[PDB]
Amino acid sequence: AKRGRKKRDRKHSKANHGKRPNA
Amino acid sequence: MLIPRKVKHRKQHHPEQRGIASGGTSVSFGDYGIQALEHAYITNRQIESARIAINRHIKRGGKVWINIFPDRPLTKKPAETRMGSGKGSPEWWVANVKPGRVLFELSYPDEKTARDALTRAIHKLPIKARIVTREE
Amino acid sequence: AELKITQVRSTIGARWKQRESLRTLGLKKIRQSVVREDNAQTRGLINTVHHLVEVEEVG
Amino acid sequence: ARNEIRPIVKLRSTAGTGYTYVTRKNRRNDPDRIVLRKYDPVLRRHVEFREER
Amino acid sequence: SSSRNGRDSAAQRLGVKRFGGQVVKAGEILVRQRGTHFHPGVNVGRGGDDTLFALAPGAVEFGAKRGRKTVNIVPVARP
RNA sequence: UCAAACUCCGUGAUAGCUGGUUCUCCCCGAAAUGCAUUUAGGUGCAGCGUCGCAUGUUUCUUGCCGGAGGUAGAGCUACUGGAUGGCCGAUGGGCCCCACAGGGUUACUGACGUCAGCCAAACUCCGAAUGCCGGUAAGUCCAAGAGUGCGGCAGUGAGACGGCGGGGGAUAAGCUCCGUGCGUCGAGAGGGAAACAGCCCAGAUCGCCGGCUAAGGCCCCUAAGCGUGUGCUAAGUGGAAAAGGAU
RNA sequence: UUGUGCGCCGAUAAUGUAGCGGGGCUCAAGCACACCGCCGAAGCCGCGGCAGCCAACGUGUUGGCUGGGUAGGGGAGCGUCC
RNA sequence: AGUUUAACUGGGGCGGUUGCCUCCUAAAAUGUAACGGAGGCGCCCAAAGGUUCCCUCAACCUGGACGGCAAUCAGGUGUUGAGUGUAAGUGCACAAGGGAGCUUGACUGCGAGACGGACAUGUCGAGCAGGGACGAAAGUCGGGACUAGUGAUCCGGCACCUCUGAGUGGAAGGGGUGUCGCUCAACGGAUAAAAGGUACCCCGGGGAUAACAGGCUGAUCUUCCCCAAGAGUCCAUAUCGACGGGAUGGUUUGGCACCUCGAUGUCGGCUCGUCGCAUCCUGGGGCUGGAGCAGGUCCCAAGGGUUGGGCUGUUCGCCCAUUAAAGC
RNA sequence: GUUACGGCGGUCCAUAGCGGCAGGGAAACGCCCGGUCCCAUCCCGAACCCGGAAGCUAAGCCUGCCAGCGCCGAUGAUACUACCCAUCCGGGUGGAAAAGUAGGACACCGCCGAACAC
Structure with a gap:
């Protein structure tokens, strides 16, 4: 829950440009 | 309840939720309409709940049109079964609803009661929606 | 008259057409520059790879 | 497939003075077996065969 | 509990x-x-x-003849 | 030590199985896909690699001309099916005049047609882009170290995630299965992302106590701006979030 | 009453703040639009040494391109014993 | 006594299936998977083949003896909505549909160039020759409107040959051409010949692969909310709030199979804790269909405390006797 | 050459069709008379075939008219989309529909033959 969401929301940073691996 | 009497193919893909409306973007037969804004699948039971919500809020006389019909099924498969081994059976029937599309149209004289009724029917649905007058 | 080219980005993350067309124009490294004609050939290559090249014009 | 007494039955089609068995598979609930037939044999030419099994 | 489908050609x-x-x-x-x-x-x-096939060498022309798409062959020019 | 002892011999039994296999540099450099398979963790051939010879730009890229497609989309009194609301009422029918025939009446069920608005992967009168097959004109050209044919030597044949398009699933999964001259990892370091194989940048011949830049960032930790200008924010929002509610 | 840009509530789990990386920040060190500079990588350039492919020339000189690399193919070598 | 007893599989088992044709998925060339979705075949055919010629249906409107929704007839509209041997698609009215006359090309000897292509298989093929059919001739005919309708190799069998004939002459036998013999259907076919158990079990391996546990998601479960039909004597909101809808938490039965099978010891009980609050009591409080005593629901609140006993291995539960209370 | 003629053909085959109105018959296209002869009906000289020209342009056919039933059909915009930018949203360069609209259109072209004429 928390852990997956924080992963999938850290991806919306600026140095990643909206995407990360394994979400 | 709303269902078709027979479909040719009783196991269909899931409809698409991509794009805006092409038709039903214009109130047709009443005066006070409902218009969607999002993408969603709207089922049989929702529309029943909504028309009852409207008829119990005008209660006497004033007409209600439903410009939607659930003519596209979806397939649940029975419980606690590992994935694989086929495709489940149709259990509930949706209509796709693209933004811009019109669902309901009322014809009751007073705008007070009419707008209120449509609001009560909006709060029975999964979509953000708004209310329309036939005017420009 | 002539176009002047300056490769800015890199060919990594870049597809076959873009890579082969940088090769066509003669560009291999970054900051290389080329003095090319402004015919349709060249304009199409730049339409292809505009995100990789700065384009200036002597004329 | 097999060799059951199938509706489509029989074979062999031999020649008079022409030994070149031409083959065909046909039914047998119909009547006939002493007329028609023709084909080209060896050294010979367009002449008449029997269906002789 | 079977999917009786699955075949194809x-x-x-x-x-x-x-x-x-x-x-x-x-x-x-x-x-x-x-x-x-x-x-x-x-x-x-x-x-x-x-x-379809060619009966005479040459080159193609997918034209119509009364509403139906045809295929043709035309004479190459001899060198 | 017994679901058939122990010892020598056959015997160095055999294992599609596990492990292990030793000095250096130079050049090029993958794959995890297809058909078959007593077969699915193995193998054979094709695929992609290199070495040698041959054929010389035939490969690839961009522009222009020629060609078929039935995808997105849209449309339907242009077919097959579903279906909303009206007009008519044949046809049906409660009922009445009562012969039941026949005369009809009434919300009645409503064909067929008709006015209007709609939907569809297995519906299409229609029909894009791209991609594709050939021709042509140049370009690259002290090279891509390209292509094709042949022969030697192989490895791989358990792929992962991300973007786009889609099936199964609950339009859930860091799920599973396909596509893709799309990518990266695999086999790829360095910088940024707080740490972080696949994300963004960029593809490491070795050295220098030299310079300019990308992505990203400039209050201190952390090198660089408590930078300039005009407005908003009062919530520590920034520095997670819905239906809905609210001067 | 419409559409907007930031905002409020809804909001809610178990070793310890703990959903800015921390201190701290609205006397923005926060959001937006324009502007100026700068830092920053093994990238590019600059000075040097080596190497492979090709080419030009002369009795091995120079120049352009090139040089991440596992499975693996090929090439050239050190060392030990007799 | 020697040996066989399949594979796929969202672990294995149970089930189902394995080859060929058609359609969608399939992403406007070709091609493309899944235990994805719909069907079908393991045939028939003196004609349902070849050729020459001729004609157009289905449906509706009307008339009409039995006759009606329809039977055969006549007259109009009718571009094609019928039918095409058999599933579907692509096509067919210019007919490949319907009908009539001759009839055997449902032939022999070949085959340029091409498709598709791992390979073996597979598909069309103009044109040449003999000898024919039909037609007045031109010209068409090497099966069926097309794609499915079947099975490699080996080993044997039948007819014919001016091939060989183990010293000679014959012959057997072996060859060749044309052909036959297989639900080898697990359909690229391990043998011509083969079903099961192991909780007596053993070995080699695997986290490629399952059970306990962790993890991701959250159908399901719990907690909570939105709108308000009504109930509540009237009174939507003291209290319960349907028909539908939106989120949480990650404890429940499950989904995926990502680390661990060269060892992560699994239900309950005891002892020992410590943590959260979505609070059982105590403490403060707002509303009442709260007279008062008792309460009902809601907000804040975690400091402390939160019993002993019977049955069951049991967790859960029920009961007895108490308790300020007998928490999740 | 030419007229309200006939015949064979073509158009990437309705811009050409259907329906209504008027109008023409010199030679030709036709309809019509009748089955003696070839020849023919799954029965019928209806059709096909044969022999002729009493009769009529009524129909077929050709000519003009009617944009009404049908068809054709743009520009511009939109949908969608390739590529690129972009922390979700969305956006930029290029390509570009369907429908709708303005409109078009009662076809065009070629050869031989006739009749007509210098």
Whole structure:
């Protein structure tokens, strides 16, 4: 829950440009 | 309840939720309409709940049109079964609803009661929606 | 008259057409520059790879 | 497939003075077996065969 | 508890094989097809399986003859 | 030590199985896909690699001309099916005049047609882009160290995630299965992302106590701006979030 | 009453703040639009040494391109014993 | 006594299936998977083949003896909505549909160039020759409107040959051409010949692969909310709030199979804790269909405390006797 | 050459069709008379075939008219989309529909033959 969401929301940073691996 | 009497193919893909409306973007037969804004699948039971919500809020006389019909099924498969081994059976029937599309149209004289009724029917649905007058 | 080219980005993350067309124009490294004609050939290559090249014009 | 007494039955089609068995598979609930037939044999030419099994 | 479906039939590699403009020799196969989607015209022949082929060398022209898409062959210019 | 002892011999039994296999540099450099398979963790051939010879730009890229497609989309009194609301009422029918025939009446069920608005992967009168097949004109050209043919030597044949398009699933999964001259990892370091194989940048011949830049960032930790200008924010929002509610 | 840009509530789990990386920040060190500079990589350039492919020339000189690399193919070598 | 007893599989088992044809998925060339979705075949055919010629249906409107929704007839509209041997698609009215006359090309000897292509298989093929059919001739005919309708190799069998004939002459036998013999259907076919158990079990391996546990998601479960039909004597909101809808938490039965099978010891009980609050009591409080005593629901609140006993291995539960209370 | 003629053909085959109105018959296209002769009906000289020209342009056919039933059909915009930018949203360069609209259109072209004429 928390852990997956924080992963999938850290991806919306600026140095990643909206995407990360394994979400 | 709303269902078709027979479909040719009783196991269909899931409809698409991509794009805006092409038709039903214009109130047709009443005066006070409902218009969607999002993408969603709207089922049989929702529309029943909504028309009852409207008829119990005008209660006497004033007409209600439903410009939607659930003519596209979806397939649940029975419980606690590992994935694989086929495709489940149709259990509930949706209509796709693209933004811009019109669902309901009322014809009751007073705008007070009419707008209120449509609001009560909006709060029975999964979509953000708004209310329309036939005017420009 | 002539176009002047300056490769800015890199060919990594870049597809076959873009890579082969940088090769066509003669560009291999970054900051290389080329003095090319402004015919349709060249304009199409730049339409292809505009995100990789700065384009200036002597004329 | 097999060799059951199938509706489509029989074979062999031999020649008079022409030994070149031409083959065909046909039914047998119909009547006939002493007329028609023709084909080209060896050294010979367009002449008449029997269906002789 | 069975899916009684699952079968399928391997391909047959149908469609056009020599498009407009190309040079074809004789007896070459322009299109394989089931029905006469494309019909013959001039210097073109039909097969058993409604395949088409060339009867005279040349080059192609997919034109229509009364509403039906045809295929043709035209004379190359001798060198 | 017994679901058939122990010892020598056959015997160095055999294992599609596990492990292990030793000095250096130079050049090029993958794959995890297809058909078959007593077969699915193995193998054979094709695929992609290199070495040698041959053929010389035939490969690739961009522009222009020629060609078929039935995808997105849209449309339907242009077919097959579903279906909303009206007009008519044949046809049906409660009922009445009562012969039941026949004369009809009434919300009645409503064909067929008709006015209007709609939907569809297995519906299409229609029909894009791209991609594709050939021709042509140049370009690259002290090279891509390209392509094709042949012969030697192989490895791989358990792929992962991300973007786009889609099936199964609950339109859930860091799920599973396909596509893709799309990518990266695999086999790829360095910088940024707080740490972080696949994300963004960029593809490491070795050295220098030299310079300019990308992505990203400039209050201190952390090198660089408590930078300039005009407005908003009062919530520590920034520095997670819905239906809905609210001067 | 419409559409907007930031905002409020809804909001809610178990070793310890703990959903800015921390201190701290609205006397923005926060959001937006324009502007100026700068830092920053093994990238590019600059000075040097080596190497492979090709080419030009002369009795091995120079120049352009090139040089991440596992499975693996090929090439050239050190060392030990007799 | 020697040996066989399949594979796929969202672990294995049970079930189902394995080859071929058609359609969608399939992403406007070809091609493309899944235990994805719909069907079908393991045939028939003196004609349902070849050729020459001729004609157009289905449906509706009307008339009309039995006759009606329809039977055969006549007259109009009718571009094609019928039919095409058999599933579907692509095509067919220019007919490949319907009908009539001759009839055997449902032939022999070949085959340029091409498709598709791992390979073996597979598909069309103009044109040449003999000898024919039909037609006045041109010209068409090497099966069926097309794609499915079947099975490699080996080993044997039948007819014919001016091939060989183990010293000679014959012959057997072996060859060749044309052909036959297989639900080898697990359908690229391990043998011509083969079903099961192991909780007596053993060995080699695997986290490629399952059970406990962790993890991701959250159908399901719990907690909570939105709108308000009504109930509540009237009174939507003291209290319960349907028909539908939106989120949480990650404890429940499950989904995926990502680390661990060269060892992560699994239900309950005891002892020992410590943590959260979505609070059982105590403490403060707002509303009442709260007279008062008792309460009902809601907000804040975690400091402390939160019993002993019977049955069951049991967790859960029920009961007895108490308790300020007998928490999740 | 030419007229309200006939015949064979073509158009990437309705811009050409259907329906209504008027109008023409010199030679030709036709309809019509009748089955003696070839020849023919799954029965019928209806059709096909044969022999002729009493009669009529009524129909077929050709000519003009009617944009009404049908068809054709743009520009511009939109949908969608390739590529690129972009922390979700969305956007930029290029390509570009369907429908709708303005409109078009009662076809065009070629050869031989006739009749007509210098």
